[PDB]
Amino acid sequence: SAQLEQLLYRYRAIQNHPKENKLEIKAIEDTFRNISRDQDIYETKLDTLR
């Protein structure tokens, strides 16, 4: 639910200082985009479902 997501939050919030030694930031941000997109899809579907 959030136990593996708050870790990603803190991991991005710690890796804002180096910002170039870690190339894996982009895939993590793509998964943030996926989570935001799925959340918006679910909110529209909950608006239609009611």
């Binding site: 639910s1 959030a2 997501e5 941000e29 943030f32 985009r33 989570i35 935001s36 799925d38 959340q39 918006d40 679910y42 909110e43």
Partner: peptide, 15 residues
């Protein structure tokens, strides 16, 4: 990347 559509998150809404 939004903000309130990113803290409100379950596995019950990924599908």
């Amino acid at each position: 990347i939004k903000l309130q559509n990113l803290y409100n998150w379950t596995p019950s809404n990924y599908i």
